[PDB]
């Protein structure tokens, strides 16, 4: 299949027509997405197959063909870009200053941008173009709007 | 059967649309990977 680095839509033909269930990142021959997008199922890329390699429901992350490769982190000060890939629409960069999720286990950057559920797995980037996490696991605050964590995995 | 389709390169765009606020929220993460607000 196609192994070129970049951002990819994750599609299904199981439902009506072709439906976009999410997005992911291809980097160093490894496909990275959120666990809730694929539920750990195998993926097709042209005539090729991508098998899951690592995954964790609590982190809500999964990697295919190899171990998680993304290790850049938000610096806690600068604006970042969500490279949003919405269903049926062109990839678009959106710049924002992340907020914070404060947890009993430490603080995580968070992006207050509202996109359809099928946009989950879109990458959040720093100014060097490095992926600092994936968009799509968060919370719905008082006013009904959506705030996603900047979810990043560990590079072993 | 899930399949992937290329959508673009991963690069920072100068003069991208700048939006979104920066809320500081107290949150909890359960064993199922669901975040919730702590109030
Ligand atoms: C499950 C999920 O993350 N979906 C969602 C819900 C509301 N607004 C945006 C998104 C991405």
């Amino acid at each position: 299949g196609e192994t070129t680095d970049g951002v990819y839509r994750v599609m299904t033909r199981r439902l009506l027509g072709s439906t976009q269930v999410g997005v992911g990142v291809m980097q160093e021959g490894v496909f990275h997405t959120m666990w809730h997008v694929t539920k750990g199922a195998a993926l097709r890329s042209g005539e090729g197959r991508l098998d899951p390699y690592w995954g964790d429901v609590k982190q809500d992350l999964v990697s295919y063909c190899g171990p998680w490769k993304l290790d850049a982190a938000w610096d806690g000060l600068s604006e970042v870009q969500l490279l949003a890939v919405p269903p049926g629409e062109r990839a678009k960069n959106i710049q924002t200053l992340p907020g914070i999720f404060k947890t009993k286990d430490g603080d995580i950057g968070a992006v207050a941008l509202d996109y359809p559920a099928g946009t989950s797995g879109s990458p959040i980037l720093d100014k060097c173009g490095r992926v600092i996490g994936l968009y799509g696991n968060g919370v719905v605050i008082k006013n009904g709007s959506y705030v996603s964590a900047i979810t990043q995995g560990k590079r072993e | 059967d899930m399949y992937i389709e290329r959508a673009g390169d991963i690069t920072w765009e100068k003069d991208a649309e700048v939006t979104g606020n920066s809320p500081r929220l107290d949150v909890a993460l359960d064993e199922s990977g669901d975040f919730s607000l702590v109030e």
Side-chain angles (χ1 to χ4, degrees), chain A residues 22-46:
Chain A
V23 181
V25 175
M26 186 75 78
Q27 184 172 129
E28 300 162 58
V30 172
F31 190 62
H32 306 76
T33 191
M34 310 207 78
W35 195 91
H36 77 266
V37 167
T38 67
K39 312 302 186 207
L43 300 176
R44 180 164 43 84
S45 170

Side-chain angles (χ1 to χ4, degrees), chain A residues 26 28-31 49-54 63-67 69:
Chain A
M26 186 75 78
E28 300 162 58
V30 172
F31 190 62
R49 185 187 173 124
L50 300 203
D51 296 323
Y53 179 101
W54 168 82
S63 71
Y64 286 80
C65 313
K69 305 286 187 172

Side-chain angles (χ1 to χ4, degrees), chain A residues 38-91:
Chain A
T38 67
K39 312 302 186 207
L43 300 176
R44 180 164 43 84
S45 170
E47 248 196 333
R49 185 187 173 124
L50 300 203
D51 296 323
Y53 179 101
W54 168 82
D56 187 296
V57 157
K58 186 176 169 176
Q59 293 182 51
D60 191 29
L61 292 173
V62 54
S63 71
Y64 286 80
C65 313
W68 186 269
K69 305 286 187 172
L70 316 179
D71 58 350
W74 178 44
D75 63 12
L77 281 200
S78 323
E79 288 194 339
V80 307
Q81 282 185 5
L82 167 67
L83 175 47
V85 182
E89 305 173 353
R90 202 147 43 238

Side-chain angles (χ1 to χ4, degrees), chain A residues 2 5-9 11 13 18 37 44 58 81 83 93-97 99-100 102 112 125-126 137, chain B residues 1-13 16-27 33:
Chain A
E2 188 172 22
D5 277 12
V7 66
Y8 289 67
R9 303 170 192 277
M11 309 292 302
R13 263 162 198 150
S18 303
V37 167
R44 180 164 43 84
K58 186 176 169 176
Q81 282 185 5
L83 175 47
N93 290 67
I94 307 285
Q95 196 164 314
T96 197
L97 182 81
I100 306 291
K102 306 157 129 207
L125 327 179
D126 61 25
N137 193 28
Chain B
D1 204 46
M2 298 184 166
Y3 63 97
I4 69 181
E5 293 186 334
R6 201 166 183 270
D9 289 3
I10 296 162
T11 67
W12 178 275
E13 180 200 342
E17 195 227 348
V18 186
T19 199
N21 65 306
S22 325
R24 289 178 197 266
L25 300 163
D26 294 294
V27 308

Side-chain angles (χ1 to χ4, degrees), chain A residues 36 113-120 135-138 140 144-148:
Chain A
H36 77 266
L113 292 170
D114 219 318
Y115 280 92
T119 312
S120 291
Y135 170 84
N137 193 28
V140 175
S145 68
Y146 183 71
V147 177
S148 171

